[PDB]
Write a sequence for this structure.
């Protein structure tokens, strides 16, 4: 059972949850520190992605320089040992750091950021040790040549940066600044994780509006306009710190990092003129992007089920699974470009075709001079440099269809098997490389029957597999605009994203919906099901246990009955008069404070502010299993009146489940009371309004 | 009193408001027709903006060719008569069509699209005659050289296209297609007006994600993900139809239209490298954009107040106000470039400086050959061509500071006076030209102390005045990206948009908030005020008249008492048992159907489907003042049970006004019932939850 998050506002001024109801210094202190924390989320995600890209380009660049040194001496067996050994060693570093120190840093974190911004309290997700294992595990596993990026891990790294900046450092290492007392809300934490995840998609692609639109469209359930401006400011500070550190280390000051433009996979030197002959391969790239994105979603759901059978078997088995996946990745990225025959160097293409090194197009791996290997252009590089080889402006029929089919089938296989291993893996770059493969294949199959470039058909195929897997339209359009710098490919990119989202929704759910189902996270979707308009929430509460209520002045003994014997996290406060909803955290707080009255007396509001500060009520640093309540003190009384949420959101008994789900998910509820049309008769949570748990208790509905 | 819109769903299956609760053909008929209508909104807004841009570039281009023909013969007095006469004639065409035929086509329509998508039933806004007067009035007033664009009018024109496509043509000219019966909802109309307004911002700037983000950020209050995809599809079909009609008429096939690129004001051939010396003029352009945008918002509020004093005085006075504004515009766009001395032609600048014609940079208006007039480059062109003269890549110190100050002070004066006249005017292009003026002035004032181009400082100044007036961040960033094609100016554009929104919010509201206040439209803002957490909705209902309720089986005489003597649009249905909320429209419908029972009988559900189709309940084609109810029939009975919204949204009496405003504006309510903690005690509408009407009844709150 994962608990939800409390984003509702107790409108008593003992709690001071509304930030505008504070002092005029403290409104200014909140406004200054939330824009400072948006600037610091931008500065720290930009600096960490600078250090991640510097370490990945230096380690994988010097590995491929050593591998190409043994390749250029025609020693192809000991260049396989250097490639397989450095990739096994970097995956061994990333996997002993994940499975022995921070196992929630495995995967991208985006299905549990989208769980957390929907209001599910996902444990161990945003920590310091989770952040540092994800930093050096992306530094290990992207430089180990694997089919993953540092793109999705940066979304988890930026939201981990945001939670440590908001709470003030690591847990039991926090500074006790009094100005960080206003970000102890769950609804101010949700703003921070939204700005940090948007800064992570901006640090992924050098994409500052597509980070804002990935948060809006995917991960954030609730959106204000006052968040979008700080989310905007966080992504602006990221891409400024990123492109300033591509402006520095331009003259080779930082090793092999920075030899490259400000714009990642910049294709912008081509004309995009729309013709009526290219309607048919553009919708074919959309239809095959939705079909292969649905097939990738179904086969990754099956692969992550069989990898969850390995992930429960032990912690040495996750090491051996990912080292076997990394051994398979390095053997098939080294040995498979021997199957491609060397194409000769085309004089119609502008730039230099006899090219050896660590990066660049037209690799010269097992060929004579004046020839190039078109498979080792893509397999024996980094995964980001292989995108720009497929994405190349004005290289017509560079890759053959056999080498494109080998690179497609390999990155289908490595797209399935490298996602579910226990490194910080991701889904932006493998789905980009699979879509690049079939998009360049459909561009090469129309040999001089089209006027769109084959490297532009690659961008259309990559955006179609990203729409066919993730079912997104607006966020990946600004992501592929801020990657590829083509403003005229943008409406054709819009058409292939919409065709692949609609062909993809015919078969599967989204790929973030699939891992949210597979991790068991209780996600609450937007539109209710049409059979929830026929079920009532009075009928939903008769299929439930009765309401564990409290009084206004309870005894201590009944409060420890509802705290020992129940697992519920809010309780209605009664007495013939519903007062509201007290929380479990405030019940453990009044047991730990020992604010115990000898008579049934409603206290005044000077007796509560002497016992409870607004920083005392917001702290969740209480456990129930330390309080030794003496049995003389169990016949004393606690006034539960001033700690009650005296205005909770209610529904009537005659309210339907579809309208109650709409109020539960629009205003951000954790507990919705049910009153009659006994002043309370029911209480609805997220578990009662998810459609799967309704269809357990009511199988006769659709 | 402007009524709100009914976007709530009656979950009885007599009404069939949920589209998924229909037949399997009709779910497919709704899905096919909503994507057909999104394609048709895209096709018709792209074709109408093609015809608007074709007519504006041919009429104003041949006017400026005739004016430059009299200028090149050194006949400067009869070129003033051709300029003033054609601008007075085109403004006379636009003003007799606005003030005598469709006076809601005056202005941009964006403060009453944002009213309509907030759920205020703005009358006479989306019609056919309003659309056609706005088409030929933008064709008149942009070709009359005025300080307005066809940018904001296209937002009203695309939403007018959307409402006529959704309802099936003009009012009392609609086709009676049975497949258009599902778009008779107000919540399906709201989806249409959102797709049409997004298609209008896309037809404004050739900007297909910035249209989607202008709807999200500004005009649409409620946002689903299932709308964003059809809104995405509508803007994709617009910019495809727009750029296909720039691909055709490229060889002069359509007159003077199409001589120009696919990208409007394309500046993309410059490097944007960030330096630490240019931190200070970039934040100076942001601070002056917020300060002059606040000063423009305050002075346009005063000018529109004094123009509302002219707009009530008659219909010939609005003609004479706009003809005097157009006479002042043409005299000061012709005569003021004689005050600028001719700068000589710089050989450091690449392209051709002795340039005469109708368009282009470096105009040669009153000069000798080898010289150019830098004021007639901006004043004696079209308003869009004068943007690209300021926005010019690599023209260093082209405009002098005196000519830039004359163009700034003129477009400040003409930005105030040409907005409130009764042509279809707008605010995107005058605020762009004012911000271009001071942005190029701050670029020229740092003479070789900066490395950002002076035409790029223009884009920063234009985005700062657009943020200083409209208080937007994300939508104008994609609008200026899809205009200027500079992906590296984009984070500097983000910084000047955020600095000018935050300096601008220190003084004023937004410029759409100001005309929403000035037109008296009851807009409902997102966050409640902090004094609404201390007021209760039980206390708000004791400062109100008591509840005009109904019974379940009322008499006819009590139904005509609540329909004659009240103006309320929903009534609670009682009897010791609250059933729900029947609407006023269903009460007039059961009086017009004459479903009158002789006894107090609750009917069965076969008696209602014989009397009421689901297309009969959705039609609002009923007036109350035609029904002649006989006094024998007033002692009969109507079963108001099957027409009731039996699950309305309720609050308790102890609920605060701040949480009730949050539920009113999140789920899209028109009537929120108040139950006790008499099963109803109150009913809240939009008027009760606006903060201004609370502060009338409760002045002691903050
Ligand atoms: N005070 C309460 N009294 C009785 N039932 C409750 C109470 N609170 C929650 N429930 C019900 O008990 C079931 C278990 O919910 P749970 O114990 O998880 O509540 P919770 O932990 O407060 O909610 P969440 O886990 O969503 O934060 C739910 O179906 C819910 O409706
Ligand atoms: N059935 C009703 N009985 C009593 N008062 C009502 C009823 N409906 C609305 N009111 C109240 O009367 C006042 C005037 O509202 P109005 O007459 O405009 O209702 P309405 O027209 O149904 O709502 P709207 O105009 O927002 O659609 C409001 O303050 C509202 O709270
Ligand atoms: Mg629980
Ligand atoms: Mg009314």
């Amino acid at each position: 059972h994962i608990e939800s998050l409390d984003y509702e506002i107790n409108e008593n001024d003992l709690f001071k949850h509304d930030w505008r109801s504070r002092s005029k210094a403290q409104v200014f202190q909140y406004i200054f520190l939330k824009w400072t924390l948006a600037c610091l989320v931008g500065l720290f995600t930009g600096l960490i992605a600078t250090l991640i890209n510097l370490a990945v380009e230096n380690i994988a660049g010097y590995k491929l320089l050593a591998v190409g040194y043994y390749i250029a001496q025609d020693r192809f067996w000991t260049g396989l040992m250097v490639f397989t050994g450095a990739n096994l060693g970097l995956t061994l570093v990333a996997t002993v750091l994940v499975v022995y120190f921070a196992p929630t840093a495995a995967g991208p974190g985006i299905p549990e950021i989208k769980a957390y911004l929907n209001g599910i309290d996902t444990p161990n997700m945003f920590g310091f040790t989770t952040m540092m294992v994800k930093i050096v595990g992306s530094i290990g596993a992207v430089a180990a040549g694997l089919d993953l990026g540092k793109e999705g891990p940066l979304v988890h790294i930026g939201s981990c940066i945001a939670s440590l900046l908001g709470q003030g450092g690591p847990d039991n290492h926090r500074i006790k600044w009094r100005w960080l007392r206003y970000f102890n809300n769950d609804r101010d934490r949700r703003d921070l994780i939204t700005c940090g995840s948007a800064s992570g998609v901006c640090a992924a692609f050098r994409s500052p509006v597509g980070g804002v639109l990935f948060a809006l469209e995917e991960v954030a359930t609730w959106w204000r306009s006052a968040l979008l401006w700080r989310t905007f400011f966080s992504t602006a500070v990221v891409v400024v710190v990123l492109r300033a550190f591509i402006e520095i280390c331009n003259s080779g000051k930082c090793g092999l990092f920075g030899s490259g433009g400000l714009i990642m996979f910049d294709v912008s030197h081509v004309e995009v003129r729309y013709h009526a002959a290219d309607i048919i391969p553009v919708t074919l790239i959309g239809v095959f992007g939705g079909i292969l994105g649905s097939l990738y979603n179904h086969l990754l759901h099956k692969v992550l089920r069989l990898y969850n059978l390995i992930n429960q078997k032990g912690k040495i088995h996750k090491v051996l699974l990912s080292l076997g996946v990394s051994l398979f990745t390095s053997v098939c990225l080294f040995g498979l470009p021997f199957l491609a025959e060397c194409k000769p160097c085309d004089p119609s293409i502008d730039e230099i075709c006899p090219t050896n090194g660590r990066s660049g197009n037209f690799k010269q791996f097992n060929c004579p001079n004046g020839y190039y290997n078109d498979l080792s252009t893509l397999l024996l590089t980094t995964n980001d440099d292989a995108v720009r080889n497929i994405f190349s402006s004005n290289t017509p029929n560079e890759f053959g269809m056999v080498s494109l089919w080998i690179f497609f089938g390999l990155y289908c296989i490595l797209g399935l098997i490298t996602f579910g291993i226990a490194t910080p893996s991701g889904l932006f770059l493998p789905i980009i490389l699979m879509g690049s493969a079939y998009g360049r294949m459909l561009g090469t199959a129309m040999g001089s029957y089209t006027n769109i470039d084959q490297g532009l058909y690659a961008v259309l195929g990559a955006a179609s597999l990203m729409a066919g897997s993730m079912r997104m339209t607006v966020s990946l359009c600004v992501i592929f605009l801020e990657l590829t710098n083509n403003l005229l490919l943008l409406p054709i990119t819009m058409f292939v994203l919409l065709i692949a989202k609609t062909v993809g929704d015919s078969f599967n759910l989204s790929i973030y919906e699939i891992i949210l189902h597979l991790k068991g996270l209780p996600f609450l979707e937007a539109n209710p099901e049409p059979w929830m308009r026929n079920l009532t929430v009075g009928e939903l509460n008769d299929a439930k246990p009765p309401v564990v209520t409290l009084n206004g002045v309870e005894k201590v003994a009944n409060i420890v009955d509802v705290l020992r014997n129940t697992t519920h996290n809010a309780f209605p406060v009664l007495d013939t008069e519903l007062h509201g909803l007290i929380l479990r955290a405030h019940l453990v707080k009044v047991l730990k404070k020992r604010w115990f009255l000898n008579e049934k007396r409603r206290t005044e509001e000077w007796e509560v502010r002497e016992k409870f500060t607004p920083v005392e009520l917001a702290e969740r640093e209480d456990n129930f299993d330390d309080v030794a309540i003496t049995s003389s003190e169990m016949q004393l009384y606690v006034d539960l009146h001033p700690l009650t949420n005296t205005t909770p959101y209610t529904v009537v008994q005659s309210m339907s489940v579809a309208k109650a789900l709409v109020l539960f998910r629009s205003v951000g509820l954790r507990h919705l009371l049910v009153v009659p049309k006994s002043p309370v008769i029911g209480i609805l949570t997220r578990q009662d309004l998810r459609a799967y748990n309704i269809l357990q208790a009511f199988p006769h509905l659709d």
User: Anything to note?
Assistant: The first helix of chain A runs from residue 24 to 72. The radius of gyration of chain A is 28 Å. The pocket of magnesium ion (ligand 4) is lined by residues B 1, 3, 567, 569 (CB under 6 Å).
